[PDB]
Amino acid sequence: GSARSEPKMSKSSQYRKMKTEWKSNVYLARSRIQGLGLYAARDIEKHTMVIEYIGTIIRNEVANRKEKLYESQNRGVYMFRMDNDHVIDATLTGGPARYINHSCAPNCVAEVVTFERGHKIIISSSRRIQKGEELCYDYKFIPCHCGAVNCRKWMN
Amino acid sequence: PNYALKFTLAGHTKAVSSVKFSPNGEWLASSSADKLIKIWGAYDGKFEKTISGHKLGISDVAWSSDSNLLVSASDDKTLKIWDVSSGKCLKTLKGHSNYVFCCNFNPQSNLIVSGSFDESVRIWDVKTGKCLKTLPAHSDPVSAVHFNRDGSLIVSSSYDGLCRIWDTASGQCLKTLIDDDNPPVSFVKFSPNGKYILAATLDNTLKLWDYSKGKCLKTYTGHKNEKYCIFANFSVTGGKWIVSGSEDNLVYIWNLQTKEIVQKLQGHTDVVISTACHPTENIIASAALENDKTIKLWKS
Amino acid sequence: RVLLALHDRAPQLKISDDRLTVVGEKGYSMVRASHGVRKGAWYFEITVDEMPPDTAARLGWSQPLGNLQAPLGYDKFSYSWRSKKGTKFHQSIGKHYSSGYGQGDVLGFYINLPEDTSEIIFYKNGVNQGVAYKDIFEGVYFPAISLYKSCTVSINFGPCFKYPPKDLTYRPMSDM
Numbered sequence: 078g079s080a081r082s083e084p085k086m087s088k089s090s091q092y093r094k095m096k097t098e099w100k101s102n103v104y105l106a107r108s109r110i111q112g113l114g115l116y117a118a119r120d121i122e123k124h125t126m127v128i129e130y131i132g133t134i135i136r137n138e139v140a141n142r143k144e145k146l147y148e149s150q151n152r153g154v155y156m157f158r159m160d161n162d163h164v165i166d167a168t169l170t171g172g173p174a175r176y177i178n179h180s181c182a183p184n185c186v187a188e189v190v191t192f193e194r195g196h197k198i199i200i201s202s203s204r205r206i207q208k209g210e211e212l213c214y215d216y217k218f219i220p221c222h223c224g225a226v227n228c229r230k231w232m233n
Numbered sequence: 234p235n236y237a238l239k240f241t242l243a244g245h246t247k248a249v250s251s252v253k254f255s256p257n258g259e260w261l262a263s264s265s266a267d268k269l270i271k272i273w274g275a276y277d278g279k280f281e282k283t284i285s286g287h288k289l290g291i292s293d294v295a296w297s298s299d300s301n302l303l304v305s306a307s308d309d310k311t312l313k314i315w316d317v318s319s320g321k322c323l324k325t326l327k328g329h330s331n332y333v334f335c336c337n338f339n340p341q342s343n344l345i346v347s348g349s350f351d352e353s354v355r356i357w358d359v360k361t362g363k364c365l366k367t368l369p370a371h372s373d374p375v376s377a378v379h380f381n382r383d384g385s386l387i388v389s390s391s392y393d394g395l396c397r398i399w400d401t402a403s404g405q406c407l408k409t410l411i412d413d414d415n416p417p418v419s420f421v422k423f424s425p426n427g428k429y430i431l432a433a434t435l436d437n438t439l440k441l442w443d444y445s446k447g448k449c450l451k452t453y454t455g456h457k458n459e460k461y462c463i464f465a466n467f468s469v470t471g472g473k474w475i476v477s478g479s480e481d482n483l484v485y486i487w488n489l490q491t492k493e494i495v496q497k498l499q500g501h502t503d504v505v506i507s508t509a510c511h512p513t514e515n516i517i518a519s520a521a522l523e524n525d526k527t528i529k530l531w532k533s
Numbered sequence: 534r535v536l537l538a539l540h541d542r543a544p545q546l547k548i549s550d551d552r553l554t555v556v557g558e559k560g561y562s563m564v565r566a567s568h569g570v571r572k573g574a575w576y577f578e579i580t581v582d583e584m585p586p587d588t589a590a591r592l593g594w595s596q597p598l599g600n601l602q603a604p605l606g607y608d609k610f611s612y613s614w615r616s617k618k619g620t621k622f623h624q625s626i627g628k629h630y631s632s633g634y635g636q637g638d639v640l641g642f643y644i645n646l647p648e649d650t651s652e653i654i655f656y657k658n659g660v661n662q663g664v665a666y667k668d669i670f671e672g673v674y675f676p677a678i679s680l681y682k683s684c685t686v687s688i689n690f691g692p693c694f695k696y697p698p699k700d701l702t703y704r705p706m707s708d709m
């Protein structure tokens with residue numbers, strides 16, 4: 078028994094009110110599912126906005142080389158698609174939201190509100206999320222390490 | 234450079250995982266995953282006593298000032314606090330949920346780190362043993378824990394080349410180091426000053442990484458390390474020497490400035506899992522896995 | 534008439550309103566022509582009018598089932614040759630061929646296609662650049678363009694060619 082011997086094989090204005098408080102929203106807190114997560118030192122209320130998925134826009138084709146980039150330094154395991162047209166990166170320079178994990182009871186979903194500068198992934202709330210509850214979103218595209226009630230223990 | 238074979242340490246039921254010498258020339262036990270720690274010797278293979286009674290295989294065992302006090306990083310998700318002349322379970326460390334890969338007593342002999350894979354890494358007390366902190370040690374499973382010359386810094390290895398020098402008093406590491414490879418790093422360690430860390434980049438090029446700049450000093454050649462676990466050693470007995478482990482039934486002993494192939498020593502029958510070094514004399518062991526089941530001592 | 538196509542485009546690509554010129558988009562996405570063959574030795578011309586400093590643009594034959602968004606040379610459907618440092622590409626891998634093309638030339642391309650009863654040759658000011666590879670696959674052979682920042686290249690299909698060589702017996706595509 079050894080793993081060593083085995084080889085390793087109205088919306089816009091309130092949204093900008095949320096944009097004026099990104100230091101004030103949260104701090105980078107942990108979660109014992111895997112490493113970090115995101116907690117809050119406050120109670121995130123109903124219809125409270127949280128975060129926007131920003132970063133580096135991939136074109137239509139550049140993901141076909143970004144998948145080769147994933148084999149050097151193992152850089153991005155943090156993916157979320159913009160659309161059929163584009164993908165947004167958060168690994169070289171961009172959004173620091175690359176530590177929003179997932180449990181099979183996710184407390185947030187993905188919504189799109191479009192500015193003049195294009196479609197933007199916008200997060201709001203639908204309930205009073207209390208202090209210290211991990212924010213995590215459903216994927217809908219490796220088993221989990223959360224230990225949740227009525228948990229699928231998968232990704233999507 | 235005419236390092237010659239002296240002894241042979243056989244008598245194993247499973248594969249041998251590690252050799253780690255005593256700090257002042259005392260002992261070298263069978264630190265293996267065979268549910269066995271036989272207290273073998275470093276000078277002539279002097280068999281002392283039998284300390285066993287485990288549930289599963291030990292990834293690596295810790296060491297002490299008198300080379301006696303142990304703690305088992307076995308694969309049964311548990312850790313007992315061991316003593317040589319006791320044979321008794323003192324307490325039990327709980328807080329892991331996967332393979333307990335590695336655990337250490339610091340050179341001040343007052344800490345028990347215990348490395349994990351799903352980042353359930355907890356730094357423990359030697360005396361009490363109370364649950365303190367889960368640590369986000371990497372984004373990957375941990376493959377090395379080590380304490381430096383004095384005992385305020387903790388280096389840890391990753392599966393993408395993170396040389397995170399974790400702080401003991403606070404818990405926030407300082408500097409992030411990187412390479413253009415995507416290296417599943419099997420092992421990192423400190424130095425006799427704590428400034429140069431030898432990581433594992435798996436294209437037959439292992440690099441000795443700087444503290445502040447994160448550069449390498451001298452990138453070696455001629456070695457074989459692409460999949461299998463191989464330790465990292467240095468020698469201060471005479472002049473400058475570079476000793477490492479191999480895979481092709483050889484013993485890797487070289488010098489730092491050369492970066493050449495000047496000495497390789499046949500005599501093994503398996504991938505060398507482990508070598509180690511001694512501070513005052515050139516007493517060097519060389520362990521291997523299940524296809525050898527021996528630990529061959531070397532001496533100039 | 535031998536011309537371009539309507540939906541052979543990306544929305545960031547601009548096929549110009551003359552159907553004789555393509556306007557470059559600053560990224561790298563593939564635009565292709567519309568009239569090709571499957572078997573025989575055929576010919577057309579791409580007249581490269583104007584070029585900025587330090588560019589990257591690849592030209593060559595292609596098959597329509599490739600990538601609509603790639604820089605040319607990404608697939609086994611097509612070959613390419615770059616305007617900087619002159620490199621032939623098979624699935625876009627650096628294999629040194631020549632030195633690339635500049636401002637004021639005509640890139641008029643030759644094809645060779647046998648059958649039981651195949652190479653791609655590039656020309657530049659009439660210079661026989663050599664052979665990229667041998668024994669290419671079966672399909673319909675369109676031209677293909679991917680460009681730098683918004684430069685100016687022209688296409689040509691008429692028999693009044695600007696640089697007609699005298700080394701091979703070729704036919705214009707406008708006979709279709």
Ligand SMILES: [Zn+2]
Pocket residue numbers: 179180181182221223224225228229230
């Ligand atoms: Zn869950």
